[PDB]
């Protein structure tokens, strides 16, 4: 009956940010002090809720979204930001109610010669709406002439590899991110703090 936060935070594999993973958390007791008292995380930051109240509140559900980005991109995981990640990969709404947690994962997600496994969406016709997810790989039309699904001149694959290398600077190193959203419905609350 303790919420399965460890499955999210301690998962062996993490998604690319364009295909960010979501886990529904419901019908459990959430002790958030396990997270906000951990020295493992460099970022723990809340919006529309105070950490002083986290263990005293009840919610219908909480959503845990996880993924990998650059360190200097962790600032984009917040309301009212723009940039490649917030525009094309993962967008938080102005009225976001939740917390963002992040930590450097250079030891796990970098590889000598460059890691081809983590990617982000480099091209898109328009910005994502908040909490929208796009995992398509349609050839992107950069010129005036259509591509007709064929990669080539002025017609680019929409995903770009981070190519994480362990020797890059800390801002360019991979970071694992978990975003907790707290949902209130006109239904009974099912995730509660220890009280």
């Amino acid at each position, epitope marked *: 009956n303790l919420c399965p936060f460890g499955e999210v935070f301690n998962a062996t594999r993490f998604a690319s940010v364009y295909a960010w993973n979501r886990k529904r958390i419901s019908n459990c007791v959430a002790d958030y*002090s396990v997270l*906000y*008292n*951990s*020295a*493992s*995380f*460099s*970022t*723990f*930051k*809340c*919006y*529309g*809720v*105070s*950490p*002083t109240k986290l*263990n005293d509140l009840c919610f219908t559900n909480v959503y845990a979204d996880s993924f990998v980005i650059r*360190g200097d991109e*962790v600032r984009q995981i917040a309301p009212g930001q723009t940039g490649k990640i917030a525009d094309y990969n993962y967008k938080l709404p102005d009225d976001f109610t939740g917390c963002v947690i992040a930590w450097n994962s250079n030891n796990l997600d970098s590889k000598v010669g460059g890691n081809y496994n983590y990617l982000y969406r480099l091209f898109r016709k328009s910005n994502l709406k908040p909490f929208e997810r796009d995992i398509s790989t349609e050839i992107y039309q950069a010129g005036s002439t259509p591509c007709n699904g064929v990669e080539g001149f002025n017609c680019y694959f929409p995903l770009q590899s981070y190519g994480f290398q362990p020797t890059n600077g800390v*801002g360019y190193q991979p970071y694992r991110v978990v975003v907790l959203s707290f949902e209130l419905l006109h239904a009974p609350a099912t995730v509660c703090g220890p009280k």
Partner: nanobody
Amino acid sequence: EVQVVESGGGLVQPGGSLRLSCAASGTGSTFSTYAMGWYRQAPGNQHERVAIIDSVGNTNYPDSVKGRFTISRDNAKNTGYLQMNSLKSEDTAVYYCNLGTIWGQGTQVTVSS
């Protein structure tokens, strides 16, 4: 019963320094067993953890304050500290601390000319 009070805050000119104190009461011989953290509030109910120290002294900080803020703990005095160097106008906020699951009301820090 456990309680924490913050102190050492106030007005400071840019580039100045402050040393905040998180003083605990009602802990017996047990203060050392809890983690302790420092947070700052921004308008819009935005709360940023600015420093964390666990029961064995492991620390961490976000990038915005790394190199400028240092958290420390005194298990004999049941007190913790946040050393804030090279303050900036953006560092203006209410700063509050926690010990385990107990929170303080906070104190104001203002960086202005």
